[PDB]
Design a protein around this ligand. Structure first.
Ligand code: HEM
Length: 441
């Protein structure tokens, strides 16, 4: 009835406990010790971290709780503005952009993005085909080049050409710098300059596109042509800019993390790699994968969901109570009280997944309808769930399928998993060697 709480440090309350490079991983250990709910205080602030499916299912009831803008999201809003990710559900622009963009992110819409995804995926595979025998792959680095360039191409038909450079395109440098600064706040001169670099490029492309009248298969065309069904209003140019920034900010790192963790688990589990590779060989019979082929990569899809189970790459989200309510029959909350969903702990709930939760077993996802509601939430919840979920999974399934078709992989360093935390998670320093199977591409 009384909620556990970890060590306090006087006026600093619990804050010193997150004085670490790996706060989510620290929080998982606190959850291991304290159980399914604990209080966590800082000077300004109180939240309650939830870890069990029993309480998280209640937290996911949208009549009772809505998305909160956590401090991290408030700092990100300095450059992501009122784009979808950093808006309250009640802001007019959240609803407008959500209504306009939702069908442009459906599974069906992936058919329209597929050619541009393949363009970047082929660039990645060709890079690896072109390595000499003495060389190796920097996995999260190459995965981030791929996802950034894919979201730039599908997002606004802009080529960052990340596979042509050691130093990233200057927009990328400013975006990555801007993100780091917002996370570190949890400089100012550089922050403003980096914001300006982002707005300038994105505003220019928007202005260029409106001028030429060109129609493309990208999200920018959808946003220039879209009208909110409720009001009949379009998004204005400022908000369109924030959405483009948001697709890059929200999408690039979580998706490259997922591809990196999935390859990690595959090289650490050779039997699973071989089963995934046999499927990729059977299904991807053409030098350029089709949309329909990617959809037949069922076990690759299971591999990706099981990677998201263990290390969901956007690991926590924040909610507030809409009205006074009692959580789990035991914990009274007041209107506005905050909850944090700790997704890696949720995904380790032994009452749902059985005792073997640390084991990498894609077969858990063989029958998606036996996973209970709200047991598996790597893309968040309800109407504030990831709008990019189909995009991320189509991209990851395509790319992983191709990697497994085209190369054998060696964990040549016997890499020890080290999870770096930013807004997202990734296996820092993960490296492999890939030997080409010499299959046409
Ligand atoms: C595997 C990769 C990804 C993961 C694990 C992921 C995860 C998430 C999660 C957990 C949220 C909810 C945030 C919260 O409740 O505060 C979210 C929201 C969002 N994501 Fe993703 N994401 C991924 C990829 C992407 C991609 C590629 C894009 C864009 C193309 C994207 C765009 C967005 C947007 C715009 C939102 C806000 C949606 C709204 O609230 O209306 N994400 N994502």
């Amino acid at each position: 009835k009384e909620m556990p709480q970890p060590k306090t440090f006087g006026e600093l309350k619990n804050l010193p406990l997150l004085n670490t490079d790996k706060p989510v991983q620290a929080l998982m250990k606190i959850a291991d010790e304290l159980g399914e709910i604990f209080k966590f205080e800082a000077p300004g602030r109180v939240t309650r971290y939830l870890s069990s499916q029993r309480l998280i299912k209640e937290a996911c009831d949208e009549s009772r709780f809505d998305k909160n803008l956590s401090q991290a999201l408030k700092f990100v809003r300095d450059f992501a503005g009122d784009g979808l990710f950093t808006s309250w559900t009640h802001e007019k622009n959240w609803k407008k952009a959500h209504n306009i963009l939702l069908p442009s992110f459906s599974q069906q819409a992936m058919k329209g993005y597929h050619a541009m995804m393949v363009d970047i995926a082929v660039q990645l595979v060709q890079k690896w085909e072109r390595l000499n025998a003495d060389e190796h792959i920097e996995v999260p680095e190459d995965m981030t080049r791929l996802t950034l360039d894919t979201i730039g191409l599908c997002g606004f038909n802009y080529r960052f050409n990340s596979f042509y450079r050691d130093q990233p395109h200057p927009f990328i440098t400013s975006m990555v710098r801007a993100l780091d600064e917002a996370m570190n706040k949890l400089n100012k001169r550089q922050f403003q300059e980096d914001i300006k670099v982002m707005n300038d490029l994105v505003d220019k492309i928007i202005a260029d596109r409106k001028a030429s009248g060109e129609q493309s298969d990208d999200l920018l065309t959808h946003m220039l042509n879209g009208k909110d069904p409720e009001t009949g209003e379009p998004l204005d140019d400022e908000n369109i800019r924030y959405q483009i920034i948001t697709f890059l900010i929200a999408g690039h790192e979580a998706t490259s993390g997922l591809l990196s963790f999935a390859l990690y688990f595959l090289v650490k589990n050779p039997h699973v790699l071989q089963k995934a590779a046999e499927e990729a060989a059977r299904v991807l019979v053409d030098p350029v994968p089709s949309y329909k082929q990617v959809k037949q990569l069922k076990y690759v899809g299971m591999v990706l969901n099981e990677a998201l189970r263990l290390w969901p790459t956007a690991p926590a989200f924040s909610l507030y109570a809409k009205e006074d309510t009692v959580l789990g029959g035991e914990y009274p909350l007041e209107k506005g009280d905050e909850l944090m969903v700790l997704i890696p702990q949720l995904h380790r709930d032994k009452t749902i997944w059985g005792d073997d939760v640390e084991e990498f077993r894609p077969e858990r996802f063989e029958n998606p309808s036996a996973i209970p509601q709200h047991a598996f939430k790597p893309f968040g919840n309800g109407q504030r769930a990831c709008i990019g979920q189909q995009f991320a999974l189509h991209e990851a399934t395509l790319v992983l399928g191709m990697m497994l078709k085209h190369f054998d992989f060696e964990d040549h360093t016997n890499y020890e998993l080290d999870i770096k935390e930013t807004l997202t998670l990734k296996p820092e320093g993960f490296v492999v060697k890939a030997k080409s199977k010499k299959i046409p591409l």
